[PDB]
Design an enzyme around this catalytic site. Structure first.
Site, PDB file in Angstrom:
ATOM      1  N   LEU A  83      25.553   8.220 -14.975  1.00 27.80           N
ATOM      2  CA  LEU A  83      24.166   7.878 -14.686  1.00 27.80           C
ATOM      3  C   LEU A  83      23.212   8.326 -15.787  1.00 27.80           C
ATOM      4  O   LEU A  83      22.161   7.701 -15.963  1.00 27.80           O
ATOM      5  CB  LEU A  83      23.737   8.493 -13.354  1.00 27.80           C
ATOM      6  CG  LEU A  83      22.726   7.671 -12.554  1.00 27.80           C
ATOM      7  CD1 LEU A  83      23.378   6.439 -11.934  1.00 27.80           C
ATOM      8  CD2 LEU A  83      22.074   8.526 -11.483  1.00 27.80           C
ATOM      9  N   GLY A 137       0.812  -1.205   0.000  1.00 24.40           N
ATOM     10  CA  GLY A 137       0.000   0.000   0.000  1.00 24.40           C
ATOM     11  C   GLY A 137       0.847   1.257   0.000  1.00 24.40           C
ATOM     12  O   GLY A 137       0.667   2.143  -0.841  1.00 24.40           O
ATOM     13  N   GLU A 143      24.395   8.867 -19.164  1.00 21.36           N
ATOM     14  CA  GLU A 143      24.834   8.008 -20.260  1.00 21.36           C
ATOM     15  C   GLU A 143      24.152   6.651 -20.187  1.00 21.36           C
ATOM     16  O   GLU A 143      23.756   6.077 -21.213  1.00 21.36           O
ATOM     17  CB  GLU A 143      26.359   7.869 -20.188  1.00 21.36           C
ATOM     18  CG  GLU A 143      26.994   6.713 -20.951  1.00 21.36           C
ATOM     19  CD  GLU A 143      28.516   6.774 -20.903  1.00 21.36           C
ATOM     20  OE1 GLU A 143      29.058   7.791 -20.418  1.00 21.36           O
ATOM     21  OE2 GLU A 143      29.175   5.817 -21.356  1.00 21.36           O
TER      22      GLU A 143
HETATM   23  N1  LIG Z   1      13.016  -9.316  -1.592  1.00 21.21           N
HETATM   24  C1  LIG Z   1      12.158  -8.834  -0.526  1.00 21.21           C
HETATM   25  N2  LIG Z   1      10.735  -8.599  -0.764  1.00 21.21           N
HETATM   26  C2  LIG Z   1       9.855  -8.098   0.334  1.00 21.21           C
HETATM   27  C3  LIG Z   1      10.389  -7.866   1.565  1.00 21.21           C
HETATM   28  N3  LIG Z   1       9.419  -7.434   2.363  1.00 21.21           N
HETATM   29  C4  LIG Z   1       8.280  -7.393   1.646  1.00 21.21           C
HETATM   30  N4  LIG Z   1       8.558  -7.803   0.399  1.00 21.21           N
HETATM   31  C5  LIG Z   1       7.757  -7.974  -0.828  1.00 21.21           C
HETATM   32  O1  LIG Z   1       7.015  -6.916  -1.011  1.00 21.21           O
HETATM   33  C6  LIG Z   1       5.556  -7.402  -1.519  1.00 21.21           C
HETATM   34  C7  LIG Z   1       4.500  -6.826  -0.596  1.00 21.21           C
HETATM   35  O2  LIG Z   1       4.708  -5.449  -0.477  1.00 21.21           O
HETATM   36  P1  LIG Z   1       4.551  -4.788   1.021  1.00 21.21           P
HETATM   37  O3  LIG Z   1       5.404  -5.553   2.001  1.00 21.21           O
HETATM   38  O4  LIG Z   1       3.105  -4.874   1.440  1.00 21.21           O
HETATM   39  O5  LIG Z   1       5.038  -3.215   1.003  1.00 21.21           O
HETATM   40  P2  LIG Z   1       4.462  -2.093   2.063  1.00 21.21           P
HETATM   41  O6  LIG Z   1       4.631  -0.712   1.479  1.00 21.21           O
HETATM   42  O7  LIG Z   1       5.206  -2.188   3.373  1.00 21.21           O
HETATM   43  O8  LIG Z   1       2.866  -2.378   2.316  1.00 21.21           O
HETATM   44  P3  LIG Z   1       1.961  -1.477   3.348  1.00 21.21           P
HETATM   45  O9  LIG Z   1       2.300  -1.856   4.769  1.00 21.21           O
HETATM   46  O10 LIG Z   1       0.496  -1.726   3.086  1.00 21.21           O
HETATM   47  O11 LIG Z   1       2.276  -0.026   3.119  1.00 21.21           O
HETATM   48  C8  LIG Z   1       5.541  -8.708  -1.497  1.00 21.21           C
HETATM   49  O12 LIG Z   1       5.665  -9.235  -2.890  1.00 21.21           O
HETATM   50  C9  LIG Z   1       6.763  -9.132  -0.662  1.00 21.21           C
HETATM   51  O13 LIG Z   1       7.297 -10.276  -1.154  1.00 21.21           O
HETATM   52  C10 LIG Z   1      11.880  -8.112   1.816  1.00 21.21           C
HETATM   53  O14 LIG Z   1      12.345  -7.914   2.882  1.00 21.21           O
HETATM   54  N5  LIG Z   1      12.721  -8.587   0.769  1.00 21.21           N
END
Ligand SMILES: Nc1nc2c(ncn2[C@@H]2O[C@H](COP(=O)(O)OP(=O)(O)OP(=O)(O)O)[C@@H](O)[C@H]2O)c(=O)[nH]1
Ligand SMILES: CC(=O)O[C@H]1C(=O)[C@@]2(C)[C@H]([C@H](OC(=O)c3ccccc3)[C@]3(O)C[C@H](OC(=O)[C@H](O)[C@@H](NC(=O)c4ccccc4)c4ccccc4)C(C)=C1C3(C)C)[C@]1(OC(C)=O)CO[C@@H]1C[C@@H]2O
Ligand SMILES: CC(=O)O[C@H]1C(=O)[C@@]2(C)[C@H]([C@H](OC(=O)c3ccccc3)[C@]3(O)C[C@H](OC(=O)[C@H](O)[C@@H](NC(=O)c4ccccc4)c4ccccc4)C(C)=C1C3(C)C)[C@]1(OC(C)=O)CO[C@@H]1C[C@@H]2O
Ligand SMILES: Nc1nc2c(ncn2[C@@H]2O[C@H](COP(=O)(O)OP(=O)(O)OP(=O)(O)O)[C@@H](O)[C@H]2O)c(=O)[nH]1
Ligand SMILES: Nc1nc2c(ncn2[C@@H]2O[C@H](COP(=O)(O)OP(=O)(O)O)[C@@H](O)[C@H]2O)c(=O)[nH]1
Ligand SMILES: Nc1nc2c(ncn2[C@@H]2O[C@H](COP(=O)(O)OP(=O)(O)O)[C@@H](O)[C@H]2O)c(=O)[nH]1
Ligand SMILES: [Mg+2]
Ligand SMILES: [Mg+2]
Ligand SMILES: [Zn+2]
Ligand SMILES: [Zn+2]
EC number: 3.6.5.-
Lengths: 62, 430, 426, 430, 426
Positions: free
Chosen positions: D245, D137, D247
């Site tokens: 950056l 979100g 280029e």
């Molecule tokens: N590679 C990686 N992906 C992450 C990580 N944490 C969350 N995700 C990915 O991020 C996606 C979900 O997005 P969110 O974690 O909800 O991002 P957010 O902005 O914190 O969401 P809100 O709390 O609603 O604002 C998922 O596909 C997760 O797999 C992380 O630590 N590493």
């Protein structure tokens, strides 16, 4: 100075349970606006959305 | 040489002085009980006696004994001359009429006597540093009564004031508007430059910058003392551009009645935050022009700056002041009047700011104190007179005033006078 | 230095004064014998306010005990703290008032008033800078309701400029203990509105409400009610006995609380007030106090203030607190409850803060409120009087002392004038 | 000179930044507390304060306090400026409307002030490194809110954006398609180079090459950090062919809207495997082009390569590079567009890759990061919009969005807009 | 920080809640007295979520206890963790509900509701940033089914944007303990469907089934059922009290779980669950805990999910595990059981992971399922209702409190609307 809709808005330190006068939602931050004539409080994000001072104060007197 | 007389009136003024002389003693290395262990840097504020004792050039007056009974018993009991701590018998009870006509009447002749004795020790006296509050009964009536005599006995000497002004929402008395509206005649006729200050502005500043959630009045006093120390630093120390106390007024005051500048200080910062940023000259210069840092709850953007004095102290190089002021000028948010193309007075002093050991304010190699004659402060008066109008329409609390020897018409004549003052700040704004 | 002359009148006045001396001698650390035994110097710094120093390092209270019956004097003299008072200050006759106002004002007390003033003059003369008078009595009954008003008139005549401060226990219908309270109340208020500069109306029903619904005492006695009243008594005069950030003299209170000359009848209150078993759970901090003050249950008059609006409120805090919190709560209270404050006064709340809280409390705070809702208390008594005076019930006892019906009619006319004045600004 | 601002938004962005700043501090030899025991190589990412302390040029934002509170308590508590670690009150709750319209609108004026003060320090600022997630979100709403402000405040500066993108099968939320389709406007209109990455591909990578059966998110972040470090290596270090950056974009972006390259890194390998195989330049160059090594679960053979940027770092020589790209052209699998006969931008840097001590990535003399604008990524969009169409056909989850100030029609306008992008990536493919 | 106000209503709600506090205080390391005694700082980092700090470092549960009989309050107060709660929150009348919904909603509870909202307001005002409400009640009988819904309606009116979260033990045919259960359930859910955002259906029959065929308890008491419910109670609010790899706020759960405004009635579950004599044999690895999750025998409602399909499920893991393993296993469940998930939602599984498992467990996980099969639970109760209402049995007791048959008709009509909506998609 400032009459976006038609009144003053001065900073106030806001606490506890509160509501916007237009959103009717809750304000999270520790900041707020306040018209000393209309006696209201808003998000700081709805200042232009309100009605004019006359409307709000004549409304307040129901 | 270059002496100054510091009179303190009302509880607010007396406590501000208790903080201010505390700051000066640390600044010049004078012990709290008046001796000096091991230049004439102290000559402005302290008179020296043959026993090695430095007595302050101060007069504390209050019509009630409580606060001056505290200072006579506190750690600074030995600092002051015993007979300049002048006390009455009856509290003014938050009433201008008492402080001016009835109870302040009796004590004035002794206060002016002590001021005369202090003056006779001066060789090169320059002006007066009066500290008081607008709302207080003694802080309005006594300051008016005293200034009406000072303006005729020592008329040529400049008179600088430091006033605590009623706030938008914070208020500790009901007849504050009347008391301020009556102090206006003093501040108009028998003054030369008075610095408004507001409690709520410093409260918000301390909440946001210093990160203290709930400060007392001592925190406010420890910033007002810093501001006045910044003003007098050019007088007590050497510098690149030392600003005289009359040069100061000649820069600040455009018109005879337009003499109510804002004051602010930077970098107002806590000790923990200070380690993570640099506090360059440019940053602190930009800090003064934010609305977040003004000591009066008014938006500078709603008016036009008329004259700004930047008093730099510490490790400040004039290159940086030049570059900073140019950067300020290019901004289209900071608007100046058309008829003052010069704008900025600059003073630079080599003495860094001193931190009170029990204080919160961090140690910094630089500081800048910005004083601005600007039209926005007119909105600060447009507030307060509107508080008066609702009450006098009902003749709300008038009987206490008229009952103590005050003329009723003085109310209307007061309300007229501010209507002329609030007009003028708008009239020059075109 | 701002001395206060205290006067007791009537049974209720004498009892509450005796408990008041209890509380403030405990505050100043004075022994039952009258010898100082306190801990701090601030206790002795302003001891001249309520006491006269006498040799042997003894302190005699500046109290004047007046009653038309010897029973109350025998009660207080034999009490826990009876021995402190000057025996010269015990002025009393023999025959009681018989709950008659005219007996107190014209026949029985008119003889003893000459002796009472000749003592009050001595205590005023021994004083360095007398500020005002602090009288305790009750508008019910005959001794207090009439005699205290007679003495009020005499002292107002002799000292026109000093503040005059009175604390009055006054009649409520459901807890009525005497038939003729409306007559005495309407005759006493007719003087209190004119001479006294402030009057703190105390109601037995509201203090019982405090005892039951807030304190949770099973069997509250009159001693507890006197304790509650004495708390606010010690609270209001705190600013001229201890240091503080915002010192408010009684005249300072008078200037801010009394808009017009006659609207000076105040409603007091105290905080914190918790049961013994529940104090362990509460947080005493300033927001909780401020919530407890403006609650309609906390106040000491039966008037529910939501049926009116405050002209002025005064919060006298004691303890160590930041000014920012105090002013913020006072602002939030009047702006969240803006409907309950008159909007032709821009700021309604006076604040004072002292640095010495009560013994045993880290912080405390006394509430004063000038509200239009007080009219309801002043209305009902007038409605009671009209019930009796219409049929002239029990006017024989009052007319036998030389009183007249025109006096009763004028008293009720003034009563209606006062209630109309309070109603006008609502 | 040559500075970059690194903004981290959402939980995913914040944790990726926690990995990235861990990778940079070791690469430049900066202690976790910001000190440097003993060349302006760190100047791009770190500001240097007179105490000898290096403060990273970053802004951490999350509308829920949890993750940044972990950052404020972990080992890197002393690294960041305490005020640039920004936290709100209420969680975005995986809702684009809450992040954009309702809650983030309160904190946008603070994050922009932080970014402005950071920029005022920067003498030679180039662009922005925004790290966020499409599913989140905050990571969708707040980035949309912030990019629109930056595109008007700093319109000339580049804006590189780093993304975790919803996968074919692996997913953690129900309304990920809605958030992604709403974020697509931000990426299209106010961005210059957005780098897609997904969790499933890196999972499969860790399974095959790094020989870990079941890794955590930290393992994925320790590869995303390696990719961004490889990108900035030409900026922080000397090299034979330093790629600027701008280029970089000039070689990556053929059309205004086709700016979504895949990213991949090589040689991703375990410490045990590397001893048995040489890892010369030719083999790592080949290792970039198999379908197995893509960080987005798509087959490059299904789409024509449009532009490739090979950033070699370590013990690499141009002869071997030219030889390797000769073979990569020689292949019939590594196809390309007819209208780009150059294809390959090459950068070479002398600094080998830095190994984090607790990581599961081997030490290697050479590394290559291949960043490729190719049409195959269109398939990834053809996936996710089909996830949208099923849900939006029923108005499946919509009432939460409309409840927080979001216009319903903006859904269709979003679905419309992506229908233009997937068309464009196909239209250039002929 | 995301503060939660908790409320208890009725005997069953008060019990399962008195248990909740014993279990959540186990995760907080709070002494029975209310003093902190935990091991790690993470316990104290978010103690504010379910408690208020008070002097002496005493943590008082932000909890409101409501009932129309003093007996439940006497048992809870004399119970194990009885002394922890604030005495003032014990709001209760004297005469009981008499298993009548009308008494709870209109006559007896209508008097006490003015008192309960004022304490709820105090808790809401003391809060820093309130998120929602956590009500425990039972849809059977008169106290819960009536007063809980009345209070939900009031609080929803006063706090329209805050989350409302209820946990409902609701009737079953074979384990019924009251004759008028269908009327109370039909009148209560008719309110819950309109006002609540997340209602967690719990059933005693399924709890006994888990106790008997999973735990192999010979004599499961009501305490065991309350333990089982409190497990999921502590589980759902885990993400906003401890750090985690994927943080899922209750609003995050609601935004993911509720497709259309009225389909929010969830089915809870917990894992791992093994008999004490067979835990030495199990491997607690992710797949094993997830193998038990989606088993029809493990969830807390009599609805076997096999007669329906899942709109959404939320799996909140706690402990140290890999993310790839979690994602693989949730992909496999919804791919191999694709017939049991609605295809018009492409992905049905929300996953959240907290780093701190329950005390004594290496791994744990809480299951939420919004399944169409829940209609069978709302169908059968209606089928009971139609049995009685068609002959107006026991209706005089309800119409004696001022209720009308028209209200019963609309309650049943709304029940049919809800079951039709749940069936329309399956
Ligand atoms: N590679 C990686 N992906 C992450 C990580 N944490 C969350 N995700 C990915 O991020 C996606 C979900 O997005 P969110 O974690 O909800 O991002 P957010 O902005 O914190 O969401 P809100 O709390 O609603 O604002 C998922 O596909 C997760 O797999 C992380 O630590 N590493
Ligand atoms: C550990 C603790 O909290 O002890 C308190 C206490 O329990 C409570 C309940 C006290 C207690 O008061 C009562 O029980 C009481 C009963 C009837 C009428 C009035 C009071 C206490 O008795 C009262 C007493 O108060 C004082 O000492 C004040 O200084 C008070 N003076 C006296 O009460 C007093 C008693 C005997 C002789 C002389 C004075 C005071 C009040 C106003 C102005 C000046 C002084 C205190 C600390 C307590 C106890 C002892 C239990 C309370 O009293 C005050 C005035 O604070 C009643 O509610 C408050 C809140 C307190 O928490
Ligand atoms: C060595 C070992 O395996 O001990 C376990 C245990 O044997 C089992 C059988 C436990 C045990 O639970 C029961 O016997 C039980 C009986 C009726 C109803 C519910 C539980 C255990 O009692 C329960 C206890 O659980 C906890 O401590 C959790 O933190 C739990 N809290 C409480 O049970 C609790 C008890 C008293 C006071 C306060 C809390 C919890 C659950 C969810 C959310 C937060 C906390 C544990 C580890 C065990 C025993 C002790 C035998 C089980 O419980 C949990 C939730 O772990 C029941 O099936 C599981 C799986 C476990 O293997
Ligand atoms: N910043 C600051 N303001 C103070 C202090 N003490 C009093 N004031 C301010 O002074 C204003 C009220 O004026 P008074 O305290 O009545 O001054 P006074 O001259 O003693 O008035 P009287 O007691 O009637 O004689 C209020 O706005 C207070 O906030 C202080 O210590 N610090
Ligand atoms: N709080 C309190 N009230 C009292 C006390 N004594 C009497 N009262 C009440 O106040 C009223 C005073 O009446 P009273 O003094 O006896 O009549 P008087 O002697 O002619 O003045 C009584 O009617 C009682 O209702 C007391 O000791 N404490
Ligand atoms: N899980 C659980 N269920 C209970 C408990 N006590 C009663 N129940 C069940 O829940 C239902 C609640 O009914 P009840 O509380 O007595 O009616 P009320 O007091 O008017 O709300 C009973 O019919 C029982 O079937 C308990 O302590 N725990
Ligand atoms: Mg004073
Ligand atoms: Mg998040
Ligand atoms: Zn709003
Ligand atoms: Zn207005």
């Amino acid at each position: 100075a400032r009459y976006t809709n038609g009144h003053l808005f001065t900073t106030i330190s806001v606490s506890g349970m509160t509501m916007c006068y237009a959103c009717n939602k809750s304000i999270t931050a520790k900041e707020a606006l306040i018209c000393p004539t209309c006696n209201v409080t808003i998000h700081n994000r709805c200042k232009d959305t309100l009605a004019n001072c006359t409307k709000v104060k004549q409304k307040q007197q129901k | 040489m270059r002496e100054c007389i510091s009179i303190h009136v009302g509880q607010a003024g007396v406590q501000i002085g208790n903080a201010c002389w505390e700051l000066y003693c640390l600044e010049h290395g004078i012990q709290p009980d008046g001796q000096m262990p091991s230049d004439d840097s102290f000559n402005t504020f302290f008179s020296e006696t043959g026993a090695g004792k430095h007595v302050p050039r101060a007069v504390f007056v209050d019509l009630e004994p409580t606060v001056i009974d505290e200072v006579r018993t506190g750690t600074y009991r030995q600092l002051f001359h015993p007979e300049q701590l002048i006390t009455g018998k009856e509290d003014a009870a938050n009433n201008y009429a008492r402080g001016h006509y009835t109870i302040g009447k009796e004590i004035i002749d002794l206060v002016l006597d002590r001021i005369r004795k202090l003056a006779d020790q001066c060789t090169g006296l320059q002006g007066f540093l009066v500290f008081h509050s607008f709302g207080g009964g003694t802080g309005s009536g006594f300051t008016s009564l005293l200034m009406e005599r000072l303006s005729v006995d020592y008329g040529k000497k400049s008179k600088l004031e430091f006033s605590i002004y009623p706030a938008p929402q914070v208020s500790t008395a009901v007849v504050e508007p009347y008391n301020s509206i009556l102090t206006t005649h003093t501040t108009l006729e028998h003054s030369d430059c008075a610095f408004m200050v507001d409690n709520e502005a410093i409260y918000d500043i301390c909440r946001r910058n210093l990160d203290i959630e709930r400060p007392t009045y001592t925190n406010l006093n420890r910033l007002i003392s810093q501001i006045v120390s910044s003003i007098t630093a050019s007088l007590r120390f050497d510098g690149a551009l030392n600003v005289d106390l009359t040069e100061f007024q000649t820069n600040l005051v455009p018109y005879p009645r337009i003499h109510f500048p804002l004051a602010t200080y930077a970098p107002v910062i806590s000790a923990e935050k200070a380690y993570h940023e640099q506090l360059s000259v440019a940053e602190i210069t930009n800090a003064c022009f934010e609305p977040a840092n003004q000591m009066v709850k008014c938006d500078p953007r709603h008016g036009k700056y008329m004259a700004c004095c930047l008093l730099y102290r510490g490790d400040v190089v004039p290159k940086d002041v030049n570059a900073a002021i140019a950067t300020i000028k290019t901004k289209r948010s900071i608007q100046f009047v058309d008829w003052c193309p010069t704008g900025f007075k600059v003073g630079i002093n080599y003495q860094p700011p001193t931190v009170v050991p029990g204080g919160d304010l961090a140690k910094v190699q630089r500081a800048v104190c910005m004083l601005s004659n600007t039209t926005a402060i007119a909105e600060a008066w447009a507030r307060l007179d509107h508080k008066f109008d609702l009450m006098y329409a009902k003749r709300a609390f008038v009987h206490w005033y008229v009952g103590e020897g005050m003329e009723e018409g003085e109310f209307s004549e007061a309300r007229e006078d501010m209507a002329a003052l609030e007009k003028d700040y708008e009239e020059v704004g075109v | 230095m701002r001395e206060i002359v205290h006067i007791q009148a009537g049974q209720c006045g004498n009892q509450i004064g005796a408990k008041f001396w209890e509380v403030i001698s405990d505050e100043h650390g004075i022994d039952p014998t009258g010898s100082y035994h306190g801990d701090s110097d601030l206790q002795l710094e302003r001891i001249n306010v309520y006491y006269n120093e006498a040799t042997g390092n003894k302190y005699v209270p500046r109290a004047i005990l007046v009653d038309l019956e010897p029973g109350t004097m025998d009660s207080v003299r034999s009490g826990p703290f009876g021995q402190i008072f000057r025996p010269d200050n015990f002025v009393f006759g023999q025959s009681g008032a018989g709950n008659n106002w005219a007996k107190g004002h014209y026949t029985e007390g008119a003889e003893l008033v000459d002796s009472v003033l000749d003592v009050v003059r001595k205590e005023s003369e021994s004083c360095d800078c007398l500020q005002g008078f602090q009288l305790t009595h009750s508008l019910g009954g005959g001794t207090g309701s009439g005699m205290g008003t007679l003495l009020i008139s005499k002292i107002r005549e002799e000292y026109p400029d000093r503040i005059m401060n009175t604390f009055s226990v006054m009649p409520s219908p459901k807890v009525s203990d005497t038939v003729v309270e409306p007559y005495n109340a309407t005759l006493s208020v007719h003087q209190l509105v004119e001479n006294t500069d402030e009057t703190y109306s105390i109601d037995n029903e509201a203090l019982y409400d405090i005892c039951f619904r807030t304190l949770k005492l099973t069997t509250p006695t009159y001693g507890d009610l006197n304790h509650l009243v004495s708390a606010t008594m010690s609270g209001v005069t705190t600013c001229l006995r201890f240091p503080g950030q915002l010192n408010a003299d009684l005249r300072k209170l008078a200037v801010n609380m009394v808009p017009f000359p006659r609207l000076h009848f105040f409603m007091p209150g105290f905080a914190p007030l918790t049961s013994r078993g529940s104090q362990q759970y509460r947080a005493l901090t300033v927001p909780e106090l401020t919530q407890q003050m403006f609650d309609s249950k906390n106040m000491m008059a039966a008037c529910d203030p939501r049926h009116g609006r405050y002209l002025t409120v005064a919060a006298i805090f004691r303890g160590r607190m930041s000014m920012k919190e105090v002013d913020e709560q006072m602002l939030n209270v009047q702006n969240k409850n803006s409907s309950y404050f008159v909007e032709w006064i821009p700021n309604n709340v006076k604040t004072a803060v002292c640095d010495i809280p009560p013994r045993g409390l880290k912080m405390s705070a006394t509430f004063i409120g000038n509200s239009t809702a007080i009219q309801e208390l002043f209305k009902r008594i007038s409605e009671q009087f009209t019930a009796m005076f219409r049929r002239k019930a029990f006017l024989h006892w009052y007319t036998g002392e030389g009183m007249d019906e025109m006096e009763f009619t004028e008293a009720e006319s003034n009563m209606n004038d006062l209630v109309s004045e309070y109603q006008q600004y609502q």
